[PDB]
Structures are given as structure tokens and as C-alpha cells.
């Protein structure tokens, strides 16, 4: 599977100094100058060969993504935006990187910029995490002191000035076009994609956005080479990823295990075991709230890699595993996720604004069982109207859990329908 | 989402960044790109919130003034984000995560415990003005599910008893242990861990040649 | 914002007296050709109708909206 010798993030769960001294001891900032000296090209070949997929909600080939803003500058400073907003529910994945191994992030940002000529990078850590940022800020201060970051980084002529931006409790801020607008200081509402972020981004200057995990692994991969990373996985879903297990399991934890490992093994080797026995598994949410839940019979068969999941009709996403024993009212579980999205969508687009509120009202009635059985496929149809028509992906995300509940748990919802009709 | 003139909250309410605060304000301005100040409205609005939790209409007017932006521009930012409070809040503003990870593991019970001790319903503030309870959504840190963020404290992995205990420390005395209250080391598996046992590999270990 | 009523040319006779009616206050008109608006597909055909029927005509050229360049990316420009 994965050996400690072969691990990208090697300071998880603390136990070690998050400061530069400890980070250096661990082996961070190694020949960083040489890396930059290798030249932006060399870094993207590394990432490309690495097959590092985006560790964010949706995995886009890192190499290509970074490559786009590798086109010649048109007189506007290129920029780096690192989304440190851990918005996805069930995902404490990133919080760990910054809190425990921040300096890795710092170097990653530097390596990141060299890859795309960003004078500076801005890290949008969610405002909720006030404590988390301070630590990161401290580490950054130290790196400037070391000369690691700032003018002539590591002596290399490259000049990089990293920043930390306060989030303000919005899941949508996380979106790529909306992170920018929050950075820009306007309301956090995703812009459209046709002018892509590379071409126009933060402050209308070439900009690129990466999940903090994506920025963090790039230096290790650069130093340790693309092949190493490439070997651990299969085809595209190739790489080491932090997988989180939260809910109805013996030991919730963020493992860090290698990718494409059997769902069972992941929750078996680590995570203790499904609380109450593997057979007490009403369903598994593989990528977090946005991805559709998969019921037990499908799960062990399938494993956690993006290709395998899309075959399964679900998304690897943030790889946040939320598990539901046979002791849970799923109709109400998914219902609160729709409540999670009505309290959160920006309302900029018509299909998400009214559609997500419409499903919330129907879902609440479904939990009570007040609604008739015919309404259940009605919500199917409302779901796909929202799925393909939304300006951003959150409407994409709201539709999928609804679709999953109807797809695998249609008989249970009908019974809740039946239960209320009987008592009158 | 509408503001109405009231003696307690009006442009009349006095607000001005402390000499120390104003200093902070500029620090924010240069962090952002030159010629760009508008981008700092949020960070600034946050320091107005740091100054005073209420952040009345008067405070937003000043923010727009200091940041020379259309006032509405600040009003829109304050309304969109839940982090900003446009109403006075209690001393603690206990925020309970009640979304799927936390729902699982009974966050509601924790809510019940909190409500009981505070003798107040969710979304209501104690007359003591030290406590204000709100059912907030995913606050991150799910591996530790039972959870209640208190002014960033982000207590974690809490059982109902711990919650009341925490309130006790806050109710009369110093703050409780910032962070989780369980045997698990951070987000290591609950009883110990089964990973990263090997000592950290040496700098340059298995470094790809050149 | 629909433009389906700005397609065909129409020729309309000049407006005339509309005095109030004493008994009920309804509008009253003595001009028969008031409510008549004939619709003609092209300017040339409408001009022909006026000439053979002997009514005086004063044609107004169609004015169509000028092409306007729009692009979502352009307003995102902090510069301008």
C-alpha cells in the first residue's frame, strides 16, 4: 500500500514541530534554489509526469491547469491563489496540512509561483479557522526571516511574496471564481467560466487556484521526482491522498494513505472498522456532501479513486468518507445537506436559488412522510433541472445527494410516504 | 437583511478605529495590491468586528469611508458573510455545528446540553450577555465531530458532559482547554495510530537525482 | 424586451377629435379612419398604397439597434 518512506506529508497528527526548525529536520526546503533553477518548464514536466490530479473538489490534471497560465505575460502580474477554505462538509483534510506542516505549504507556494511566474500568492484560509491561520502566518514570517521567501528566495533570483486572506464563513467562497471575488473584496458570488481564471483572475490579472493539498504535494513531487508519485496509483488517479473518515466508525481519522485503495481496506486497515460491524452500513458518502452516497452492496466492490467512482456514478471529490449506519434516517441525513445548501448558495443564479429551496421544502416533507409517493420522482426531475443549468457547480452538488437518495433508497422514502398516510 | 434606525444602532452610534486599530487597517491595505484598497473591505470589516461585535450601521459607514468604497459595497459584504454580526452578540457566541458529520455523533445532544445549561433556546442570547447560541453549519474539523466553536476556540470531539464543563469554565473563570477533549492525538485514530510510525525520513532521503 | 412587434411596417392615419360624451363620459370620435392601421411588409409596398388611395404619406426610415460589443470578461477589468 504505502510506506512511511514513501509519504508526501510526513508531519500529520503533529507530534512534531510545525516550525521551520522541525520542518527542516523533517527535510523541507531542500535544494529549493536548485528546483527553481531547474526552470518553470522542468517543474511542469515533473507535475505532468507525476500525473498529480487536483486534490480539490474536482480533480483536473495539475500539470495542464498550471500550464495554462504558463503562457507569456501580457504586462499584468500573474498570481497564485491557494484555497485554504475547508468548506466541504466532512473534510478536515486540509486543516491538517496548515496546522501541522505549514512550511510545506510555504515552499509549495514558492515552487508554485516559479511554475507560473506569480509575483505573489494569497492563501484564503476560512475565517472560521482563526487559530489555524495565525500558525501559518507565523511560519511564513519565519520563512521570510530565513530568506526562504521574499526577494531572491533562497538566493534564487525569484521574488515571491506570500499572503493570508480572511474567509468569512462561506462555503461558496471556496469556488474558484468566487474565491477571487472575495479576494477582490466584492460579494462572494462565482463569476462565469468563459473568461477562464488563467486569462482573467484575481484583480483581473492572470490567476490560478489550487486546493491546498495540490500546492503542498508539488514540492515533494518535484524533489522526489514524477515517477515516484506516478507509481503509487493507476492511470490518472495516481497519487498519495489524505482520506478522511468521519462517522459511524470505530476511529475517525485522516489517514494519508495511498490512493486507489479498496474502500473496505481504507476503513479497515485504518479507521478501525464500521461501528457496529461492516454490515451496519446503510450507505457511504465517498467525496463529501456534494458527491452522491453509495449503498453498502456497491461499496466494497468499488475502491476510492476518481475513475472508479465515476464508473460508480459518485465523485472522489474531497475524498471525505461519511458513513451512515443502519441507525440513521437517511431521508433526514440528506435533508440537512439540502438545508446545508439553502443556508449557503449565493442566489446569483435562478436554478440554484429557487431549486435548492424547492428541494429543501420537499425534502422536509419527505422526512415527515407528508408528501405522496408521486412527488419522489418529481424531485428527480427538479434535481436535473438544477444540475445542468447552474452558473457554478454548487447547484451541481445539491442535485447529486437528492439523486442518490432516490436512486438507491427509493423504497424507504415510499414507506415514510406510506407510514404517514396510514395514521392519517 | 434590512437595517432600520434605532437608537442603539444608528450612524449616530460612535465608531472610529482606535489609533492602534487604524494602524492595523493600513497593514491590511498594502498586503493587497497597490492601487487596490477595495479588496480590503472584508479584512477591515473584520477589525471593525474585532473592535466591537455589534458592528452597527455607523461602523460599516466608517469602513466604507476608510476604504473609500461605495457604502453599499460594504453593506453587501457584511450581509453576505455569517462571520460578521450586524446585531450585538453575547460574550461567547457559542456556535454548534449541526450538519451531517456532526449530526452523526449526536451534535444535537450537545446542542441540547448547551441549551439546557444556558437555559436558552438555540438562536437566543442569555440575559447575562456572555452567551449566544447558534446552530452553525460545517466548521471543518469533522474527524472530531462533536464540536462547538467559541470565538475561534474550536473545541472538538466533545461529549455532552465536556460541553457543560466548558460552559462552566466560561461561566465563571478562565477559558477551557482550547481544542479537543479526548484521548485521540489530534485526528489520529481514536486509540493511538497505525501510520507514520517510522521516524521522519532525513532531508534528501530518496531525493530524485537532480 | 421582445422585438416581434418591431418587424412589419405599419401606416397609420393622423389622429383626430376624441371629445368626452356628456351622458356617460365615454370617449367619442367623429373620425372613421382613426382605428385603422394597415400593416405592410415592406416600405415600397406601403408607399404604393398611399399613392393609389390618394392619402398623403411621410415615411419614417426604420431605425434598428446598432450592433453593440459585449463580453463578460471586459467588466471584470479593474483597470477599467
Amino acid at each position: 500500500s504505502l510506506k512511511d518512506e514513501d509519504r508526501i506529508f510526513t508531519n500529520l497528527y503533529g507530534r512534531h514541530d510545525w516550525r521551520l526548525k522541525g520542518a527542516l529536520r523533517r527535510g523541507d526546503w531542500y535544494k529549493t534554489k536548485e528546483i527553481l533553477l531547474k526552470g518553470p518548464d522542468w517543474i511542469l514536466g515533473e507535475m505532468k509526469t507525476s500525473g498529480l490530479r487536483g486534490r480539490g473538489g474536482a480533480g483536473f490534471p495539475t500539470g495542464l491547469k498550471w500550464s495554462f497560465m504558463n503562457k507569456p505575460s501580457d504586462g499584468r502580474p500573474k498570481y497564485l491563489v491557494v484555497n485554504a477554505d475547508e468548506g466541504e462538509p466532512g473534510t478536515c483534510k486540509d486543516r491538517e496540512i496548515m496546522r501541522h506542516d505549514p512550511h510545506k505549504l510555504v515552499e509549495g507556494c514558492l515552487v508554485g509561483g516559479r511554475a507560473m511566474g506569480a509575483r505573489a500568492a494569497y492563501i484564503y484560509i476560512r475565517g472560521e479557522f482563526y487559530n489555524e491561520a495565525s500558525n501559518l502566518q507565523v511560519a511564513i514570517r519565519e520563512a521570510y526571516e530565513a530568506g526562504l521567501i521574499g526577494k531572491n528566495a533562497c538566493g534564487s533570483d525569484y521574488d515571491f511574496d506570500v499572503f493570508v486572506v480572511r474567509g468569512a464563513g462561506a462555503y461558496i467562497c471556496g469556488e474558484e471564481t468566487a474565491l477571487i471575488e472575495s479576494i477582490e473584496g466584492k460579494q462572494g458570488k462565482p463569476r462565469l467560466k468563459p473568461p477562464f481564471p488563467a486569462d482573467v483572475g484575481v484583480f483581473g490579472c492572470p490567476t490560478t487556484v489550487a486546493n491546498v493539498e495540490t500546492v503542498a504535494v508539488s514540492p515533494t513531487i518535484c524533489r522526489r521526482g514524477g515517477t515516484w508519485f506516478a507509481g503509487f496509483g493507476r492511470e490518472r488517479n495516481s497519487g498519495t491522498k489524505l482520506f478522511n473518515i468521519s462517522g459511524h466508525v470505530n476511529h475517525p481519522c485522516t489517514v494519508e494513505e495511498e490512493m486507489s485503495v479498496p474502500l473496505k481496506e481504507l476503513i479497515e486497515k485504518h479507521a478501525g472498522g464500521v461501528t457496529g460491524g461492516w454490515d451496519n452500513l446503510l450507505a457511504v458518502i465517498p467525496g463529501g456532501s456534494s458527491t452522491p452516497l453509495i449503498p453498502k452492496s456497491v461499496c466494497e466492490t468499488v475502491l476510492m479513486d476518481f475513475d472508479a467512482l465515476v464508473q460508480a456514478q459518485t465523485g472522489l471529490g474531497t475524498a471525505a468518507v461519511i458513513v451512515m449506519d443502519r441507525s440513521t434516517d437517511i431521508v433526514k441525513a440528506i435533508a440537512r445537506l439540502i438545508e446545508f445548501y439553502k443556508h449557503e448558495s449565493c442566489g446569483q443564479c435562478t436554478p440554484c436559488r429557487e431549486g435548492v429551496d424547492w428541494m429543501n421544502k420537499v425534502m422536509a416533507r419527505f422526512v415527515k412522510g407528508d408528501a405522496r409517493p408521486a412527488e419522489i420522482d418529481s424531485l428527480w426531475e427538479i434535481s436535473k433541472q438544477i444540475e445542468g443549468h447552474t452558473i457554478c457547480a454548487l447547484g451541481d452538488g445539491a442535485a447529486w445527494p437528492v439523486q442518490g437518495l432516490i436512486r438507491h433508497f427509493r423504497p424507504e422514502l415510499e414507506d415514510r410516504m406510506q407510514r404517514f398516510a396510514q395514521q392519517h | 437583511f434590512v437595517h432600520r434606525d434605532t437608537p442603539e444602532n444608528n450612524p449616530d452610534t460612535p465608531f472610529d478605529f482606535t489609533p492602534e486599530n487604524y494602524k492595523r487597517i493600513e497593514a491590511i491595505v498594502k498586503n493587497y495590491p497597490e492601487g487596490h484598497q477595495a479588496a480590503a473591505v472584508l479584512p477591515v470589516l473584520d477589525l471593525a468586528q474585532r473592535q466591537n461585535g455589534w458592528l452597527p450601521i455607523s461602523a460599516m459607514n466608517k469602513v466604507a469611508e476608510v476604504l473609500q468604497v461605495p457604502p453599499m459595497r460594504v453593506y453587501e459584504v457584511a450581509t453576505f458573510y455569517t462571520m460578521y454580526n450586524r446585531k450585538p452578540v453575547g460574550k461567547y457566541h457559542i456556535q454548534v455545528c449541526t450538519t451531517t458529520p456532526c449530526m452523526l455523533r449526536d451534535s444535537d445532544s450537545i446542542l441540547e446540553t448547551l441549551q439546557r445549561k444556558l437555559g436558552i433556546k438555540v438562536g437566543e442570547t442569555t440575559p447575562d450577555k456572555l452567551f449566544t447560541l447558534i446552530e452553525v453549519e460545517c466548521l471543518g474539523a469533522c474527524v472530531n465531530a462533536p464540536m462547538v466553536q467559541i470565538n475561534d476556540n474550536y473545541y472538538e470531539d466533545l461529549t455532552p458532559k465536556d460541553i457543560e464543563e466548558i460552559i462552566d469554565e466560561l461561566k465563571a473563570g478562565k477559558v477551557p482547554k482550547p481544542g479537543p477533549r479526548s484521548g485521540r492525538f489530534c485526528c489520529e485514530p481514536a486509540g493511538g495510530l497505525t501510520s507514520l510510525t517510522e521516524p521522519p525520513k532525513g532531508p534528501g532521503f530518496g531525493v530524485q537525482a537532480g | 424586451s421582445g422585438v416581434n412587434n418591431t418587424k412589419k411596417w405599419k401606416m397609420e392615419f393622423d389622429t383626430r377629435e376624441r371629445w368626452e360624451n356628456p351622458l356617460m363620459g365615454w370617449a367619442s370620435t367623429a373620425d372613421p379612419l382613426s382605428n385603422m392601421v394597415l400593416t405592410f411588409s415592406a416600405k415600397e409596398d406601403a408607399i404604393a398604397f398611399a399613392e393609389k388611395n390618394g392619402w398623403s404619406y411621410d415615411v419614417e426610415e426604420k431605425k434598428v439597434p446598432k450592433p453593440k460589443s459585449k463580453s463578460y470578461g471586459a467588466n471584470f477589468s479593474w483597470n477599467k
Partner: peptide, 29 residues
Amino acid sequence: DYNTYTFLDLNLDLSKFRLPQPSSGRESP
């Protein structure tokens, strides 16, 4: 272990290590 003004003050300190930022070149967007 941090007071409310820990971050901003830290940021003020970070100024000793930053180049003069660039500008779009206009008085106000």
C-alpha cells in the same frame, strides 16, 4: 492560544518583508 488581534498584528510585522505592490494604474476601479 491567540488573542483577537494576533493575526493582524502579525501581518503588520510581515510588512518588513514585502516588495512594493504593483498597481492597475487608476485612481479607483
